[PDB]
Design an enzyme around this catalytic site. Structure first.
Site, PDB file in Angstrom:
ATOM      1  N   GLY A  48       0.814  -1.206   0.000  1.00  0.00           N
ATOM      2  CA  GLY A  48       0.000   0.000   0.000  1.00  0.00           C
ATOM      3  C   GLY A  48       0.851   1.260   0.000  1.00  0.00           C
ATOM      4  O   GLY A  48       0.475   2.268  -0.589  1.00  0.00           O
ATOM      5  N   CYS A  49       1.998   1.203   0.670  1.00  0.00           N
ATOM      6  CA  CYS A  49       2.918   2.338   0.738  1.00  0.00           C
ATOM      7  C   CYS A  49       3.516   2.562  -0.642  1.00  0.00           C
ATOM      8  O   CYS A  49       3.628   3.693  -1.112  1.00  0.00           O
ATOM      9  CB  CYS A  49       4.043   2.043   1.735  1.00  0.00           C
ATOM     10  SG  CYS A  49       5.383   3.276   1.868  1.00  0.00           S
ATOM     11  N   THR A  50       3.905   1.467  -1.284  1.00  0.00           N
ATOM     12  CA  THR A  50       4.499   1.531  -2.610  1.00  0.00           C
ATOM     13  C   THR A  50       3.527   2.091  -3.643  1.00  0.00           C
ATOM     14  O   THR A  50       3.875   2.987  -4.410  1.00  0.00           O
ATOM     15  CB  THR A  50       4.959   0.132  -3.080  1.00  0.00           C
ATOM     16  OG1 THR A  50       6.045  -0.321  -2.257  1.00  0.00           O
ATOM     17  CG2 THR A  50       5.412   0.180  -4.531  1.00  0.00           C
ATOM     18  N   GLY A  53       2.464   5.810  -2.953  1.00  0.00           N
ATOM     19  CA  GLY A  53       3.609   6.649  -3.258  1.00  0.00           C
ATOM     20  C   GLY A  53       3.841   6.815  -4.752  1.00  0.00           C
ATOM     21  O   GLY A  53       4.059   7.930  -5.226  1.00  0.00           O
ATOM     22  N   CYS A  82       9.468   0.104   0.198  1.00  0.00           N
ATOM     23  CA  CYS A  82       8.758   1.313  -0.201  1.00  0.00           C
ATOM     24  C   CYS A  82       9.696   2.510  -0.184  1.00  0.00           C
ATOM     25  O   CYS A  82       9.681   3.329  -1.098  1.00  0.00           O
ATOM     26  CB  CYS A  82       7.589   1.584   0.738  1.00  0.00           C
ATOM     27  SG  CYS A  82       6.513   2.957   0.211  1.00  0.00           S
TER      28      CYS A  82
END
Length: 156
Positions: A48-50, A53, A82
Site C-alpha cells: 500500500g505504501c508503494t 507513493g 517502499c
C-alpha cells in the site's frame, strides 16, 4: 463556505520535527507559502505504501504546476522496499508520533487477533497559510491521488 477549513490544528504542530532521508529534519512551517498535501500511511503495509507513493509520484508534475508540494508521513518502527522506491517528494518519519496525534490518525486496529494502535491511512490538504481545507480518512488508494489533485484545483 465550501472553501472553509474542516480541521483545526494546535499551532505547535507546525514546528514538530520530521526526519528526512539523509537524516536532516523538516517541518510544516518550512512548507508555508505553497499548498501542501500531507498523506499518512501505515508501516504494516508495504504494498500500500508503494502504490500510494508511486501514484502521487506520477502526478507530481501536475501537483507542482498547481502550486503544491507533497509530504509522505509514517513512523519508523522496529517491528523498507517502499522507501527504496525513490519518490520525487520527501518521505518523513514522525519519530514519537507527535504529528500523527495532532492529525488524530493513530487508531485502534486488529492485527491477527491482537488489538494494537497504528496509523489509519489518511490525507490532508493544507493552504499556503496552514488551513486544513480537506481531509480523507481510512483512504481507499484506488483513485485517491487523482481525487486529491482535483480537490487542490477546486480550492485554487
Amino acid at each position: 463556505a465550501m472553501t472553509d477549513a474542516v480541521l483545526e490544528l494546535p499551532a505547535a504542530t507546525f514546528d514538530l520535527p520530521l526526519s528526512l532521508s539523509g537524516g536532516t529534519q523538516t517541518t510544516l512551517r518550512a512548507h508555508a507559502g505553497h499548498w501542501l498535501v500531507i498523506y499518512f500511511y501505515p508501516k504494516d503495509s508495504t504494498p500500500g505504501c508503494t502504490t500510494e507513493g508511486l501514484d502521487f509520484n506520477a502526478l507530481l508534475p501536475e501537483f507542482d504546476k498547481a502550486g503544491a508540494k507533497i509530504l509522505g508521513v509514517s513512523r519508523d518502527s522496529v517491528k523498507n522496499f517502499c522507501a527504496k522506491q525513490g519518490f520525487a517528494f520527501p518521505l518523513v518519519s514522525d519519530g514519537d508520533e507527535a504529528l500523527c496525534r495532532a492529525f488524530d490518525v493513530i487508531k485502534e486496529k486488529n492485527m491477527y487477533g491482537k488489538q494494537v494502535l497504528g496509523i489509519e491511512r489518511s490525507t490532508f490538504l493544507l493552504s499556503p497559510e496552514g488551513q486544513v481545507v480537506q481531509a480523507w480518512r481510512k483512504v481507499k488508494v484506488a483513485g485517491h491521488a487523482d481525487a486529491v489533485l482535483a480537490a487542490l484545483k477546486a480550492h485554487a
